[PDB]
UniProtKB/Swiss-Prot annotation:
It comes from the Eukaryota. This is Low affinity immunoglobulin epsilon Fc receptor soluble form. Disulfide bonds join 3-131, 6-17, 34-125, 102-116. Ca(2+) binds at residues 92, 94, 112-113. Residues 5-127 form the C-type lectin domain.
Amino acid sequence: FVCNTCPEKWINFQRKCYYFGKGTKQWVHARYACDDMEGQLVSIHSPEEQDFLTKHASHTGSWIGLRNLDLKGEFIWVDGSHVDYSNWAPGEPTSRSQGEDCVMMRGSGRWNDAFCDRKLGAWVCDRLATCT
């Protein structure tokens, strides 16, 4: 059972399909963009996925599906899972909390948290690949 069929302009990695959005956006706006294309902001759970993502990342930094939820103090992916795998840059995260906190991936693939109204030139979506 092979799962690597993807919509046009999406790229397959394993069980998921990925989209590498371009265009200046805030976090919540990037969230909407992902929704528009029937995906959601990427959730990252392993070295191999990060490694995939780093090799296709934008140099200017990208929004990802991670944000601080001060009602549990924690960073939660938009898929609902907690942080297992992490790729925080040195000293990060710095800004929990501070309710309005969102996460971004640097050109280098390393993460840092950031004010949500910050404007990033890229953003990444994922979704399930279809199968055969």
